[PDB]
Symmetry: D2
Subunit: 127 residues, 4 copies
């Protein structure tokens, strides 16, 4: 509950390191836009949170701010699916960092096969 | 509670029409990344939600899906500020709609003067 | 010919100032992707050039670099159309500037009616 | 001369297949913004062109149109460097394709080591 929005959505962190942040989100009702699919805004919120955590870590816990996000929503995910997120750096300098955040789903019917649903690039200035 | 995650964050919708959607968000602790500023992911979530509501309306209630979001974070907003959001169409065709979403803040000290903090373009596919 | 790509494409500048840069591009064969429509890459090249010129001017002719561009291609333009470009600042601080670049077309048949075909946001760091 | 503005800038295509398009660009004076670095607009123009060629191929030669481009400029390239470009699909469906385009440079001094300078995501609508 230090990212309260992520906590509220039921996101759970797996790995944190300066080169990689992962976690998971069961797609629950609070996560959905009204057709019982995952809200694209929730994918965007995830991308921003994990990229900012990554950047903080990669910068020596100096202050960072997201200044641009670009996200592609590739496929929908349904209520009851499970989403996996992974953030990694595309570029780290002293001033600008760029992170990529990928989201994949698995379903009730098929739980093995991670299907890419979202891909994002987050640009951050590191103070 | 026509967008459940936004409702839980304290967002209130104001105007809905086929050319303009608005509402407001008090910047409360649940909306903040941990330095007591508004979470950039929340700004993204707002852009996606309002653009989607707009498109759904402007399309005559066909199914719409956000496929790309680009957001610029221009300025931060602090805990205790009030955020105002406005979505309007940049382009509406039969298949693709592009909506712009602007976020402004006012503060405790200065409540007259809306200061732009974020601007977003959301690309949606319709029917 | 200080932006040689723009010169090569036949772009012509109209107004330069720290708050507004305009010009025009006849849509000629060199400007087209192979269906005799304006190349989306050419719109993107315009957006980058004008935004960078604007930022240079607005920054006191200090060094600037484009670090992110996001562009929406809203409508096509045909061989023989005329394109108009306008760059203006969305946000100017000391470190980050954000410019918007809009492109409109007029056609042989209809020359009065400027139809918006492209809209872009360019994020620049100003050194 | 399957993309005329790129051809005039000195771009050479290398590989075409439904999952990968490549080519190269010597960074010559015609490709430069005026401080003797590669024009960011040229990097954008490359992304759009190659993603579009890819989509046209991966769709079985249906008509495709770029509707959104997001590009991160990570590092500059100097006059005299050589740029390598590679486009590959992130998502291919029937209606929307998303392609990623990476640009790398090598230099006169160091010709072995490809250094990533740009990364782009291009969203296209097909048929």
């Amino acid at each position: 509950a230090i990212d309260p929005p992520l906590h509220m959505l039921g996101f759970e962190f797996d790995e944190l390191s300066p080169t990689r942040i992962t976690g998971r989100l069961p797609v629950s009702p609070v996560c959905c836009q009204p057709f019982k699919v995952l809200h694209g805004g929730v994918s965007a919120l995830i991308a921003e949170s994990l990229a900012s955590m990554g950047a903080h870590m990669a910068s020596g816990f100096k202050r960072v701010a997201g200044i641009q996000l670009s996200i592609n929503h590739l496929k929908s995910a349904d209520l009851g699916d499970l989403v996996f997120a992974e953030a990694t750096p595309v570029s780290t300098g002293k001033t600008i960092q760029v992170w990529e955040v990928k989201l994949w789903k698995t379903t009730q019917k098929d739980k093995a096969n991670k299907i890419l649903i979202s891909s994002s690039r987050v640009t951050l200035i590191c103070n």
